[PDB]
Amino acid sequence: ALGTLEFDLLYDRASCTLHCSILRAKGLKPDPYVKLHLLPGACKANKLKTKTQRNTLNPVWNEDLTYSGITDDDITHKVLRIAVCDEDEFIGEIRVPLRRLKPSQKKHFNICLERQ
């Protein structure tokens, strides 16, 4: 379909931090970069992005992006939208409810991107 995205999420409860390791993508179907949007809210604070990789459908970022101020209740209610885009157009996205995470347990994802 649209390709796959590999990333890790780790919630560190004591420091109230969500660590998002954006690793790589494979088989993108269109200069890819990834943007993270922690929902809900259009707030600047909710939005992080990787560097842009050039001339590739198999970019490797190996980039750690982090949110601070993350509480238990944020973990149960918030959603992390992860979108890969083509720098200068939408390539694909996934939507991850944070309540799938456990404190201090890194979860590894390899997920198929979607149009949704």
UniProtKB/Swiss-Prot annotation:
Cell compartment(s), UniProt? Lysosome; Cytoplasmic vesicle, Secretory vesicle, Synaptic vesicle membrane; Synapse, Synaptosome
This protein's source sits in the domain of life called: Eukaryota
Ranges for the C2 domain? Answer: 1-111
Give the UniProt tissue specificity note: Predominantly expressed in brain. Also expressed in testis.
Q: Which residues take part in binding Ca(2+) 1?
A: D31, D86, D88
Subunit composition and interactions: Interacts (via N-terminus) with UNC13A. Interacts with cytoplasmic dynein light chain DYNLT1. Interacts with UNC13D.
**Domain remark text:** C2 domain 1 is involved in binding calcium and phospholipids.
Q: What does this protein do?
A: Calcium sensor which most probably regulates fusion of vesicles with membranes. Binds calcium and phospholipids. May be involved in calcium dependent neurotransmitter release through the interaction with UNC13A. May be involved in calcium-dependent spontaneous release of neurotransmitter in absence of action potentials in neuronal cells. Regulates Ca(2+)-dependent secretory lysosome exocytosis in mast cells.
Q: What is this protein called?
A: Double C2-like domain-containing protein alpha
UniProt source species: Homo sapiens
Q: What is the lineage of its organism?
A: Eukaryota, Metazoa, Chordata, Craniata, Vertebrata
What portion of the full-length protein is represented by this chain?
89 to 216 of 400
